[model samples]
Target: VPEPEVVATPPADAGRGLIRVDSREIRHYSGTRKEPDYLVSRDNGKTWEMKAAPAGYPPNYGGIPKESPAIVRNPLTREFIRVQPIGGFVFLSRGGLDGKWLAVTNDGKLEEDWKDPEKRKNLKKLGGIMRTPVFVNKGRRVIVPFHNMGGGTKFHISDDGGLTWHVSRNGVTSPRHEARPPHQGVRWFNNAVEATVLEMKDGTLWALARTSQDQAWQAFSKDYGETWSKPEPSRFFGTLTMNTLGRLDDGTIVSLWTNTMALPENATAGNGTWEDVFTNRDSHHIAMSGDEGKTWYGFREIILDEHRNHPGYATLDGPEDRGKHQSEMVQLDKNRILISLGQHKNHRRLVIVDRRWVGAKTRATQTGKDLDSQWTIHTYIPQKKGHCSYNRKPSAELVQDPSGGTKKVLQIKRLDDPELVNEKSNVDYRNGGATWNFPNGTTGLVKFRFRVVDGEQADDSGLQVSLTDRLFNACDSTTKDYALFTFPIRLKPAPHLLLGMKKVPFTPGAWHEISLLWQGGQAVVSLDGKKAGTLKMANKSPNGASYIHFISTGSQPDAGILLDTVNARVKH
Candidate 1:
């Protein structure tokens, strides 16, 4: 006989004054015949009771390969709806087989089985991870946010309760220049991944996405999830981890997220590499917002992993579970909240908290500060554009600074093709933009270290940097003021000093520091800390200078530019 697997029982509900709802699989490994048992606690998680799977439920109903289960009560029918994702299909059960159970899509029709290749292909094209929460709006509409694997983000919507579903319009896509290779499709390093959606008290729909840019990006829809605004960086700093959003009964918005930037001091192993740093996922925090999500305060650390243990294989306490990853919470009552810690040890730990405890005044940590220190306006990567005419296809990578020091560097390679030239006519091919506003009479210093990596040394190919008041408007005929600087590599006697460009010799493979100082009505240029040239502004001073564009253009051969520690500072 085969040796029996040592499957651990569910962990006791250790939370105080909170009800816990979770599931446990009574088998060692996934894909095996197992019984998924649901456990619930009513008395502040002091005790838990194991319940059988809903009648007629399939074996391993809540097992692996299945997204976390969401339980929501319908106000009209007073029926509890349970939804879970299996592969590309969403399984819905009302009262767990007692009321009604079926599979459906956003189109208000029954869904097909994933085992069918054709059906699987159709579902894969939709491409969504259903691990986040399923929200029921005030109008009795059920909205489930999913990370669209195709590109951007998507949400599954249902008008007739849980009978049928439909997908929302595209939420946000990777910025133009960031669309290049190595990025699956137009997604720039999971540009819109694992998003959470919330319907505010004012009927406004808000969604937050986990992005590779080291900050959570947000989009809002006033007309429900049908349309969304262009995604912009939010005040939340979520380093490539799942996050949850919930509105309390009292109309306060609460967010639970993993603080990748403020990981425990012991989580230093992943500090060397960017992937490790972003995926550390060691600590979880809660932030409350009284005024929607415009401003957030009162931050408190709820979960922390101090020892940074990385247990290996067949264990939930392994490196994969170093910190809390997928967590979901719901308003249990006006004064109590219930939280589910999904995927932790696979043992399902539930936590409950008093409303007063969660709402109490505490020291609030600032969000979006980690990446703010770097002041990154934009970053470009490679991905697909599909049929979208608006695509920015530039390639960039993080590289070691050959000149040494602890500086972080980026190597950008420009693609020179007839198709690229045509695309540039519609959109600015620049890779980066603005972080903060540049008011009138603003005296500031902008500096960066650059080295030409490849391309013709005396050709028309070169790199350019500019400070502009507004982005180049291809739609509008109006033009904006800009201070442009170009370093040409052609055989010309000197660089073309057009608009604001000054002659400067740029040698290949040799690193040089370039600085631009603006004060009053004059702008000064310095190469390697030495004054290279000066130019007088056509206007007394620049007005509304709010963007920095990094551009590289050429005819035949492409140019590669390596930039390090692009820093900008403003002083009044």
Candidate 2:
């Protein structure tokens, strides 16, 4: 038997409030830091239960895998069956059969049947160990989902408990997920993986899979697990990590996953991964869909890993270190929910979430703020939080006003910082800062003051400003853009983005105010309150979820431009 890892398994509501948390027993930072020997038992201990802990001392977690496996009562057999992936093949253990292991040989034969040395020797090459929690569709067919290393998600269907299993008629293919420059279409690493399946109220099966693309992609199946539709993007945007989806009793859909949009671009990772490939596992967010899986609102942070921004050498946690990922969730009666979070030790947590706050519609409001100590945006909307800098020294930080003011101001990151992300020649986002929900309402105006104390760096990334429609942090060079420059220096902006160039100029030392006026896709940019140019934005969200971004792309990017005191109002 392979060592059991703590994987994402649905919390089974095993009659009454006695629900099962996970399949295996790894001593947790259990019971609110009181007992480290046991796992989670939430609330005031009135509800929640676990199947008997492993006999003898629970295994220490220093080298434990974050994922365990899924265990649910077989509806057809009424037996406690555990589904787990060891290497490439999926296995099953049935309580009714007295806890014996059975492996699927793809030819519908068990490894025990052959038992020959040559037959068992080929087991290592079967290749498919994705630990997504398994669930039975409304048709009572057991569905097991796993991803292929090359790129795709396929399923094994079992109609009779754990006895016979058949492959799906068709499988879902991973999307292109082509990221920004340098790392686009890198094959194996860029493909989709870690998918989960849930049955909707309408009796349809939906699969939510993790992808290199910004959001979770969805594939729907009408005839249970037999066939699947093509993959489409979902609102659950984040980096590559598993997300758990299920519906509330009241018919609302609840989604739990790490929404990495709030974090700045981080595209540098070792061990053969692309920049910002793994969404920062700093925090996990919870949101609900009231009308099926359409519009999601009530987005808020539930569990935050203590190591929010630890500048560890590696972006992903090694097997020896537990981090924030591989989470599972279950609804606990009424509007209350029970959640199990993290992949391994040091990062696992359990929380009881209430549906009230997450079900309310997200509403945007007018905004104004001064660039002081709490440099975060105030009265502004954030699809994701924006930052001045990331993971390096002397990056974004508050500084004393150079021109001699009592208040402090914001200094954006330098493109040449030791750990800068997406640095390229004359690019827009070499180093930048942003404020979410810029124009909060339909038809709005915004103005901010900026000054170039040190002259803009030549041959460095040019200073620029842009907006993304309903995007957390967006600047696709492929996008057609228009701009209003603050100074006249030679810089080639992305032709796809900038409609036409030249014109706007500025003095290095004087603080100049820039104004932006927009109503729908049409926008106007101004210098010192005078119109410099008009814009035609493509990704504008009609529902008002757009945000503003400022960039400084010089090699010595810091001090290229200093920004302070922002004001905005909704015309509607």
Candidate 3:
């Protein structure tokens, strides 16, 4: 791996909108049970966290095993709807061991089952349930997708939220021994991986399915899965099967699947040490379609590590060529993305971190009077060779503790001060690292400015800042959000000073101050010291608090003035 490069670190919002790209490794363990690992990215795909459902439910519900966790957030209820494996156990009813379990996120707490007596009654009959549930809202109607291993894809609709279900069959068939392909006869379904459904902006429904064997199909429903189109081979079909469906924030429908390709050494049958018939790991890739499901961006590899020690891929393989490529993806928001690799035995997770945050940038007006009092000015100079000069530097670094106690520290370090070169500087730098942990659904913001130091010569000097939400909840891990700074069209050096402000919509040529104020009901970002943007802060870890950090980036090692008076607050 290459050394970590310092692209740009501005105080909490410097590089607020620039996008970046990097691979994040997430580790997964069987922990105390045999549940399959799940990866979720609530913030698009910026970061990722791993979670697993509890072993079994109903306490007395023995022989019920859980695996293959799938979740979706309900738009109307704002609840996280989750589906997990329930049957797949041995003894009792034929395949009675396998069933689907449902749950939801209620008031920041996850309720494992619905309380409505009617809903529980319907759920009881869904013994050997199919894959994860799919949601389709139709004029107060909510429909879920289900497919039994016997090749019956069905739907259960609820008009009164999920309290009641109206079942319907799609008429698709999974003939026990029907053979119509290059391989052989149709085999009884031992397991059918979860199926995902997408409702296009035009209200068209596209359903996708993958068999544990080696087959994937796509079926369309113009009337919201009430009536359907014939099942067709998906572009991502063949040996590399098992896929999940999702729609990107940009309206692109994506199909992520685990492609079981031949290993480099085991490229051919007799190339290397003999395994059963083939040998290869499950290499995952994604296919995106901008025009609904009519077209796709072709298959592109997203996870590939030879070492197999990089979180998601570092797991033990099952016997024979049966199990290796078990993968899934959840398109968080625009900044964070999460991918789960490996399967039940030795699962790992890979989080693809984008380099840049999203949104446009804006600057504030700094009158001559405010510069003298509201702001502190300092001249930064570089004495080292190959050093870069940065001017208009205003930054602040804050450390936050979970107890609503934040220690705001400001420092203006020169790139290579003879003092920094001393051994003491190195020792003190270690203690410079700070931490801020906001409670669940808490928000934090940092503000500052940047500029080129006087007598300093350089090109392309700018402010680079970011605010990181290190959520504690593994489920909310990738949900972390951050932002950087942006330059307004206007604003010249010196004569016309530009005060950096939050990137919220404002008059083109206006000077306004922004602050992070927590007034219950989601953190409110006030402009001109007033409320501007308000969004609920995602819950971090249940036991730990979310953290925040801010840094200034530029040509000179440390070439800016980190203003004092940085503030962080929490809401009840």
Top candidate (lDDT): 2
Per-candidate TM equals 0.49, 0.63, 0.41
Taking the tens digit of each residue's C-alpha lDDT, what string does model 1 give over 280-306? Answer: 343455667778766554333344332
lDDT of 1: 0.46
Ranking by lDDT: 2, 1, 3
Clashes of each: 14, 17, 69
Residue range 72-103, candidate 3, lDDT tens digits:
33455544333334432111111111233343
lDDT of 2 at 37: 31
Q: Give per-residue CA lDDT, model 2, range 1-572, as digits (tens).
A: 11112232223211111234333222122211111133334543224344444322122111113334344555555554444343423344444323444554545555543234466543323236444434566436777776766557778677755456677877666565443443333322445566778887777888888776667788889988789998887766665666777677788887777754433232433222533233345456676777887666544555455543344412334423343555666665576666677644456655667776454323222212323211222111111122211321223445666788765666654444333333431223334453433323446676777666454454554555654433233222221142211122223331112324645666666677877677766767777866777766545342343345554455554445566666655544
1 against 3, candidate with superior lDDT? 1
The best candidate in terms of TM-score: 2
In terms of TM-score, how similar is model 3 to the real structure?
0.41
Whole-model lDDT values for every prediction: 0.46, 0.49, 0.35
